[PDB]
Amino acid sequence: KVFGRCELAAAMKRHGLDNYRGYSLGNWVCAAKFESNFNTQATNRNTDGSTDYGILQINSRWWCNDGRTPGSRNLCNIPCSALLSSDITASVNCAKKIVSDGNGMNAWVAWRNRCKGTDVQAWIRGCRL
Numbered sequence: 001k002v003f004g005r006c007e008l009a010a011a012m013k014r015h016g017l018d019n020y021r022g023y024s025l026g027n028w029v030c031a032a033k034f035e036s037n038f039n040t041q042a043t044n045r046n047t048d049g050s051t052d053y054g055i056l057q058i059n060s061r062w063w064c065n066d067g068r069t070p071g072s073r074n075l076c077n078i079p080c081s082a083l084l085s086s087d088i089t090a091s092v093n094c095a096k097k098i099v100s101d102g103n104g105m106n107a108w109v110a111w112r113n114r115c116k117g118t119d120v121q122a123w124i125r126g127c128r129l
């Protein structure tokens with residue numbers, strides 16, 4: 001599923017991402033925009049052999065299990081395929097774990113390089129939230 005901007009914002013808010021760890025909803029929408037283009041099925045292989053999965057491109061080295069990342073942890077205790085569902089619940093729960101790990105949303109390279117410090121409120125403009 002490819003979410004619309006306001007649809008994803010509303011789903012993220014319902015799942016409790018708005019202001020989670022102090023990151024406004026727009027930060028999460030922006031991160032999903034630049035990580036996956038709002039596509040829940042986005043997968044991207046990294047050179048170290050891990051893969052990023054889903055709307056928030058959660059990595060298989062630490063957070064999910066994909067059975068093909070030797071030496072990997074599965075801290076969200078979830079199959080990586082579950083981060084590709086049209087229902088983003090699993091991705092959000094895992095992102096909550098990720099953003100609490102120490103470096104906040106800097107865990108997402110696209111958020112740090114394309115969202116951090118920008119007018120992230122633009123990402124929720126016009127949404128009935």
Ligand code: NA
Pocket residue numbers: 059060061062063064065066069072073074
């Ligand atoms: Na893993």
